[PDB]
Tab-separated table of C-alpha atoms in Angstrom:
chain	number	residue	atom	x	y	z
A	1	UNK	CA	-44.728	-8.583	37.641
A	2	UNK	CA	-41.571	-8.102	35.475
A	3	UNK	CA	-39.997	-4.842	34.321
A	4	UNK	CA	-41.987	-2.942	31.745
A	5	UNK	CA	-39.846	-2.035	28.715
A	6	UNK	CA	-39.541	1.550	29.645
A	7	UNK	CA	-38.245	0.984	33.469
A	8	UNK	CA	-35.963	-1.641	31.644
A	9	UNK	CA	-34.765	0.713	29.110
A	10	UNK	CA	-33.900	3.111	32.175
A	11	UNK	CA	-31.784	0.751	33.955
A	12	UNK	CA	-29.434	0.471	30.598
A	13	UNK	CA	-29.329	4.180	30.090
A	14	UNK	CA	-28.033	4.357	34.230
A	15	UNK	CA	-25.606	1.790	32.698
A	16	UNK	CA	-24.069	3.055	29.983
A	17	UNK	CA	-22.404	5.943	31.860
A	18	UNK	CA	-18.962	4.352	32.698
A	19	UNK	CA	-18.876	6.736	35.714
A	20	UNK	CA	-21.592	5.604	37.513
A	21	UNK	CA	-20.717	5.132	40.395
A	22	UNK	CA	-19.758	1.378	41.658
A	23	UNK	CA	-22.642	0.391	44.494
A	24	UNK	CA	-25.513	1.916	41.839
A	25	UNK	CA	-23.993	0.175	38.772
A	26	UNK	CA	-24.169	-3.210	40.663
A	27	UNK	CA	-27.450	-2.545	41.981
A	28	UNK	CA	-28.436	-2.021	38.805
A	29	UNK	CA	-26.920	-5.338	37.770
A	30	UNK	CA	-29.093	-7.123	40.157
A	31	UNK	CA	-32.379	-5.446	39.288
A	32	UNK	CA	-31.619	-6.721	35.749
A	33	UNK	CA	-30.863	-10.513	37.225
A	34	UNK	CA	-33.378	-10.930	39.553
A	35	UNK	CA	-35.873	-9.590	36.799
A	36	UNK	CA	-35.049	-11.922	34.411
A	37	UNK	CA	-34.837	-14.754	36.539
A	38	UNK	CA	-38.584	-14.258	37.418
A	39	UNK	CA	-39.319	-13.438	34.429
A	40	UNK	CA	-38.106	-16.836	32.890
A	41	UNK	CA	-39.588	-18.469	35.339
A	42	UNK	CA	-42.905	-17.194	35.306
A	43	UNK	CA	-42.819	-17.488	31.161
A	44	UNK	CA	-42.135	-21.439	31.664
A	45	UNK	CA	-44.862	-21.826	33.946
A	46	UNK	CA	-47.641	-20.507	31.325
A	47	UNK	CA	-45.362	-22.715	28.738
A	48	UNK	CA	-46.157	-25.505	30.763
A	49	UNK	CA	-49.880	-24.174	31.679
A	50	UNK	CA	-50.754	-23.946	27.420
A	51	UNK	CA	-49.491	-27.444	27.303
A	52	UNK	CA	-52.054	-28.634	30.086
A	53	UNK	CA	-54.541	-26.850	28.525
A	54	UNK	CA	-54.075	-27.804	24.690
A	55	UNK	CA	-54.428	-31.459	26.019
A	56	UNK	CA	-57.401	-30.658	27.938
A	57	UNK	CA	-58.724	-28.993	24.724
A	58	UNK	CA	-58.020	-32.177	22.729
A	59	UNK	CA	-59.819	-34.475	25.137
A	60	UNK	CA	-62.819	-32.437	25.892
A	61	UNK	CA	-63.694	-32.223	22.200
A	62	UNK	CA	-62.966	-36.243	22.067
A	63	UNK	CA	-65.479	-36.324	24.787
A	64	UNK	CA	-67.865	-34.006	22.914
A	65	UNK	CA	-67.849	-36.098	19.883
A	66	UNK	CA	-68.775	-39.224	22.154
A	67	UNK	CA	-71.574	-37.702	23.559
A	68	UNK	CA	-72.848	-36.587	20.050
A	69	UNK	CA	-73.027	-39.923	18.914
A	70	UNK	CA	-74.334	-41.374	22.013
A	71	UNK	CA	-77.078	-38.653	21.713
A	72	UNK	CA	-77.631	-39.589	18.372
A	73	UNK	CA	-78.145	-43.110	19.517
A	74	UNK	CA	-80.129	-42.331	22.075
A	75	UNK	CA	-82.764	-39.944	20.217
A	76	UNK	CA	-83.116	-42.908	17.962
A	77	UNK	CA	-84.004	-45.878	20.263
A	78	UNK	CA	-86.318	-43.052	21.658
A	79	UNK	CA	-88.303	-42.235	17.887
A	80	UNK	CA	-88.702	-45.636	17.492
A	81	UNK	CA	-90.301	-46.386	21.157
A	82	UNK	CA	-92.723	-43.620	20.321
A	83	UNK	CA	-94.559	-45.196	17.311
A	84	UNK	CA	-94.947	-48.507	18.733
A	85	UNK	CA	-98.507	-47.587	20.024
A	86	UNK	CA	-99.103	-46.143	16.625
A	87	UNK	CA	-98.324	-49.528	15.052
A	88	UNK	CA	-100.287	-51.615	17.136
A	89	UNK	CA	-102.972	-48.710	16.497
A	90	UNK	CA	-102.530	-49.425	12.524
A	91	UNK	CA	-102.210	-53.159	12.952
A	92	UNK	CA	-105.559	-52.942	14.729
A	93	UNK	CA	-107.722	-51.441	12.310
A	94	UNK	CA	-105.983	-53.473	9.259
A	95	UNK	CA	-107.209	-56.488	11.433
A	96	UNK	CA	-110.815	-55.079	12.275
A	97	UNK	CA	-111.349	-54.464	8.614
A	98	UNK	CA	-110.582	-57.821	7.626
B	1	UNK	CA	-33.355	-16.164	22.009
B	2	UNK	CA	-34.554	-15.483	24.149
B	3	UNK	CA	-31.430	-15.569	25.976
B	4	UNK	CA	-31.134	-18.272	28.581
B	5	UNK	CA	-30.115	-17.044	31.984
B	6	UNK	CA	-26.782	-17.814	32.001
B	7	UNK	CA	-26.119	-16.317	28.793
B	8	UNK	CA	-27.871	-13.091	30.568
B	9	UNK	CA	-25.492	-13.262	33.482
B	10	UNK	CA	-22.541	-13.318	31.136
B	11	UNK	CA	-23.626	-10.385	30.000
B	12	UNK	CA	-23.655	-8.537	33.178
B	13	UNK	CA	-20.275	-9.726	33.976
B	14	UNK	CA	-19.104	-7.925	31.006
B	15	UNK	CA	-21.012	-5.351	32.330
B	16	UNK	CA	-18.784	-5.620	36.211
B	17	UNK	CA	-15.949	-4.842	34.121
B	18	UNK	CA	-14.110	-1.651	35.114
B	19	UNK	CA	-11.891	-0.812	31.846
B	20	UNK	CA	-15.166	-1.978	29.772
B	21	UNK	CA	-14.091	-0.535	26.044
B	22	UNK	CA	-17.145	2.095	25.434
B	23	UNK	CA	-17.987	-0.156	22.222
B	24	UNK	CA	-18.123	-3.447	24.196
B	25	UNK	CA	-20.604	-1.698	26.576
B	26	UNK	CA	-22.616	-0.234	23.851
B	27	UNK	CA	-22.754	-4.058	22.534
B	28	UNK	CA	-23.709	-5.607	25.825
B	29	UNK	CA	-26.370	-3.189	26.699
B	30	UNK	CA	-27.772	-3.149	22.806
B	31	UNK	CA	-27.780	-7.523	23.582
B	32	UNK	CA	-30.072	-6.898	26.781
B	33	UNK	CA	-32.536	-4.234	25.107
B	34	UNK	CA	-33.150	-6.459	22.054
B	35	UNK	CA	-33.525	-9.781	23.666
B	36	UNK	CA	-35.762	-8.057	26.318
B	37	UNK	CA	-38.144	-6.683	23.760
B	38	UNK	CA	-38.251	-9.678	21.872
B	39	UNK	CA	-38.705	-12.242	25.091
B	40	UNK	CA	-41.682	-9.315	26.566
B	41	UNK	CA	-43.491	-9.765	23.054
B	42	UNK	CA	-42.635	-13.467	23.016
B	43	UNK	CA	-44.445	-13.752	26.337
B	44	UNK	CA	-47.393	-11.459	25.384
B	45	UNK	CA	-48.305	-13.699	22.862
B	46	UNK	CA	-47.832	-16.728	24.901
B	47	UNK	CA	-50.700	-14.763	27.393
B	48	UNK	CA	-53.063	-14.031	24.441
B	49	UNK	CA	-52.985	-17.271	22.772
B	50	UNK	CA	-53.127	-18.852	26.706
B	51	UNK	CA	-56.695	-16.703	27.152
B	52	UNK	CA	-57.811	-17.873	24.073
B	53	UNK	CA	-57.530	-21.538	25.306
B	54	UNK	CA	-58.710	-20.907	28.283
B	55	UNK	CA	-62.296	-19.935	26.770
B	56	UNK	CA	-62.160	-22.046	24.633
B	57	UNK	CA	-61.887	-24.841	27.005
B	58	UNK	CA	-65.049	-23.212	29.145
B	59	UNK	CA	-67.217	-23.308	25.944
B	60	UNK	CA	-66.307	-27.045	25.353
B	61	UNK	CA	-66.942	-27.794	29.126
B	62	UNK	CA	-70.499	-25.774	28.939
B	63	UNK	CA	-71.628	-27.998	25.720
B	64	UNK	CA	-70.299	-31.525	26.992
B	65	UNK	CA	-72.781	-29.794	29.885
B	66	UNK	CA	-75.671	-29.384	27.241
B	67	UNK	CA	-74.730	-32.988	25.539
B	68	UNK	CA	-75.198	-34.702	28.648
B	69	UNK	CA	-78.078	-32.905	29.973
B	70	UNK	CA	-80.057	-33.989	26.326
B	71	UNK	CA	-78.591	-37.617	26.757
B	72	UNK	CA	-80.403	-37.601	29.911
B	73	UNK	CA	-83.367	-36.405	28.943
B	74	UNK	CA	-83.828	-38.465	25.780
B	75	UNK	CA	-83.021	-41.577	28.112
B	76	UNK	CA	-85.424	-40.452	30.491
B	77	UNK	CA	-87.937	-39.980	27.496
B	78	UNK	CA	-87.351	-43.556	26.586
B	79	UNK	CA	-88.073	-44.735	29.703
B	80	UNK	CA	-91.392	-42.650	30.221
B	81	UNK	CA	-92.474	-44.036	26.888
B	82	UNK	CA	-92.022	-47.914	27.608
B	83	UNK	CA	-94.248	-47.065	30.860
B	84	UNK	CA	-96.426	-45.880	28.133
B	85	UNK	CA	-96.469	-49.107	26.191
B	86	UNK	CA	-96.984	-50.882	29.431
B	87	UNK	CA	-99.873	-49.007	30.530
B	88	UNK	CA	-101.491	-49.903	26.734
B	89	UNK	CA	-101.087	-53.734	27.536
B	90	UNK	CA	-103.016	-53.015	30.844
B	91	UNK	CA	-106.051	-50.847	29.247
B	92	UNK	CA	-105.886	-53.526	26.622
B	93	UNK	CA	-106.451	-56.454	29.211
B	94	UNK	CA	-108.841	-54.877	30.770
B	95	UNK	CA	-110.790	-54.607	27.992
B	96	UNK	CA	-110.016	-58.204	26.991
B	97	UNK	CA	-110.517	-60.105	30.235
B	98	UNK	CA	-114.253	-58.762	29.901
């Protein structure tokens, strides 16, 4: 992973001495670029992951509510299929006490 | 900010400079620590509020899960009860045809 403040922090301290030498100040130099570089990169990849993922959020609870009504539906047509025998039932006896 | 990574590489030119004024360094190196702090706390946020959304999205998938499972069953349940109706007609004809 990238450079945690503190080793950061270390590699400006090296850099503020002006007599440091040459071949340390511009390995320095690259520690801080190639850091950075990854660590831009690797931050646009999770901006672009939280994007993916706040879409997927949207649609799954789209989804969700479409199955919650289609449940609703569904538990209905059923409620309704199980008092049919009980009508007939009451139907029956209105018609045998007649 | 955070700084792009061009605008970082200026930076470290300034920084390749041998007869770098001692304020000018103190600048440049005062640039890097603050946009470094900012763009690690930037991108620790980013990874929080990335987690977060990433269980939220397993919670959503777990109760489209549940939905579905009790749309099946209440479809299934609708079935098994027009069997039920169908098996009253018969015991009724039965008892008819006598």
């Amino acid at each position: 992973g990238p450079l945690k403040p503190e080793e950061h922090e270390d590699i400006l301290n090296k850099l503020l001495d002006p007599e440091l030498a040459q071949s340390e100040r511009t390995e320095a130099l690259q520690q801080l670029r190639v850091n950075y570089g990854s660590f831009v990169s690797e931050y646009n990849d999770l901006t672009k992951s939280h994007e993916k993922l706040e879409k997927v959020r949207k649609q799954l609870e789209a989804e969700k509510m479409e199955l919650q009504s289609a449940l609703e539906e569904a538990e209905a047509s059923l409620e309704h299929e199980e008092g049919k025998i009980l009508r007939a039932q009451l139907e029956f006896n209105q018609i045998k006490a007649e």
